[PDB]
Design a protein around this ligand. Structure first.
Ligand code: ADP
Ligand code: ADP
Ligand code: PN4
Ligand code: PN4
Lengths: 309, 309
């Protein structure tokens, strides 16, 4: 049956890809690989360049509408950033997807200044999660300072000249105590996190009545089947453990003393008991709120793009 | 502090009507007076013509974008209506606002076909409300078949060739037995109802995960102080009562049989015990989710307009 999404067929996707010259210079190819050494350049050419080009159509149409309204309404021409959000399971590739889209979108002269903010920064710090008995519930709704996350995007959509977000580090598994990131009226702000499509219903312990989505222009849910997500999560955990072999400041220091087999069992249980329950209860149900659903397969290659009609 | 809204006072909003020349036609005037005899044409020319022109800019921007996307999407796809929703208290003037905008938006050659659907039709019938003890809660979240309403707008946004809504009559105070209304791909659909800005959080008894708002391009919340809403509610009730003098099939015949004074007492209790409580608990908290908040003062005169930046 018909749904609110069109699924791109290969001729529509190819025409999008081929609509512009947008293959990259050598230096740009180098910086892309620096985002993630496992990123395929074939994916960049077949998937991420066209997806960034698709977004440009939306962003550009919005700038023109803004010019038309400022003339009509007689307003002072104030800059409002276009906000793109990126949702999905832990370990689906939200960060990589977001960093790739930041780099590619910045190539278009109409919107060169692209910022990226993760919702991880808005987690309550470990001290606080401890106080509340939620250290096993990191990434669940009760673990976020949701009111502050909404205020951040709300302030941006208010035309504030600067806004400040707290910052989180996966390497030390916590919010950086004085590591705040200040942004100033970018053309585009990408908001990356598992909870960007969540709403007041997900926070009954402390309700809010205006949602992140109410301040977001375009949202992407990055989707993938459970088994792939689990293996991606375990592999990434093993990578951090490896890092910890030589870096004493890694939070994975003690995991690097275990056998690999035991480390795998731990990661497996973290996935099963925390991130997978979080997916099923809180993340996956938000999926049909997205502007666009990008589905991933083997080796992270995107096999389906659905866009709201 | 700056907010997410451009704020216009009446002087500033009315000043828009010259910014782009516009005057009502002769046929339009007759249509308008047939919509509401108490509706001022000056109020139409000063407030609603500029509002309609605002909306045309949004709608036209969308149509232009759609044309551009069609370059790679192709033209085979189904026509999707632009959906405008109208929220606010019982008796604020949603229906009047909707019907006026339907009349005025028909002007433009870009979008001549304009349908109007009220969420009233998606109320559970009185028999069902009686089963569930909800008869004193008509208009509260539990009194709606919300799943059916989300599906209706979802279907429209899926490109169905036709979609069908149930219809309600204030005259018989119930859903009409076999009175369903079918719409066929209009250019604009106006959805009018107190609950159009509500979400799953408002339906904890039977939650939904994609909201009405997720299928709405542009939302208006019509706002006014409680004391005016009360007066407008009571006056309307007395007008329904008069209509029932010569109409014993009106549910208001029950009140036509009573003295005016006692009828006013009843109407006032219904306001205070049902609609005012609904406003405070369920309607007003959704106001900040609107694209535009239009505020009214004495005699329905608009004194402030707020539009999302
Ligand atoms: N497009 C991709 N190509 C190859 N590997 C990827 C891709 N996206 C993500 N990954 C890998 O999958 C894992 C999860 O990605 P990450 O961006 O950290 O997910 P998230 O931010 O959603 O938690 C990481 O190990 C990352 O290197
Ligand atoms: N713009 C207006 N000018 C004059 N009277 C109005 C206006 N809007 C609404 N009314 C009156 O106020 C009452 C409530 O309006 P209605 O459109 O029935 O409200 P709702 O649909 O919100 O319940 C009605 O008696 C209506 O005639
Ligand atoms: C050094 C400790 C390793 C355990 C990591 N915990 C988990 O994967 C379970 C909690 N989830 C997370 O830590 C997720 O990465 C987060 C909620 C921050 C979303 O990006
Ligand atoms: C006895 C016949 C008139 C009773 C009117 N009821 C009320 O005003 C309370 C219930 N609310 C309503 O009937 C509202 O009009 C509705 C919820 C349908 C929103 O358009």
């Amino acid at each position: 049956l018909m749904t609110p999404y069109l699924q791109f067929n290969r001729h529509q996707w190819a025409a999008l890809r081929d609509s512009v010259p947008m293959t990259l210079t050598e230096d740009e190819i180098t910086r892309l690989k620096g985002i993630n050494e496992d990123l395929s350049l074939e994916e960049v050419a077949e998937i991420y360049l066209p997806l960034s080009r698709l977004l440009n159509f939306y962003i550009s149409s919005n700038l023109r509408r803004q010019a038309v309204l400022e003339q009509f309404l007689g307003t002072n021409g104030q800059r409002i950033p276009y906000i793109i959000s990126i949702a999905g399971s832990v370990a689906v590739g939200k960060s990589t997807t977001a960093r790739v889209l930041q780099a590619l979108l910045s190539r278009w002269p109409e919107h060169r200044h692209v910022e990226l903010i993760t919702t991880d920064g808005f987690l309550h710090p470990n001290s606080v999660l401890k106080e509340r008995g939620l250290m096993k519930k990191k990434g669940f709704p009760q673990s976020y300072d949701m009111h502050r996350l909404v205020k951040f995007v709300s302030d941006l959509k208010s035309g504030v000249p600067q806004a400040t977000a707290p910052v989180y580090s996966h390497l030390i598994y916590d919010v950086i105590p004085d590591g705040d990131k200040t942004v100033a009226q970018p053309d585009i702000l990408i908001l990356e996190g598992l909870n960007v499509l969540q709403s007041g219903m997900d926070y009954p312990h402390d309700p809010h009545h205006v949602f992140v989505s109410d301040f977001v222009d375009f949202s992407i849910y990055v989707d993938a089947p459970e088994e792939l997500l689990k293996s991606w999560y375990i592999n990434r955990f093993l990578k951090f453990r490896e890092g910890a072999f030589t870096d004493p400041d890694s939070y994975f220091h003690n995991y690097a003393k275990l056998s690999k087999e035991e480390a795998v069992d731990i990661a497996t249980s973290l996935w099963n008991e925390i991130n997978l329950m979080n997916l099923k209860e809180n993340i996956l149900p938000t999926r049909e709120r997205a502007s666009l659903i990008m589905t991933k397969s083997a080796n992270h290659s995107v096999n389906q793009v659905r866009l709201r009609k």
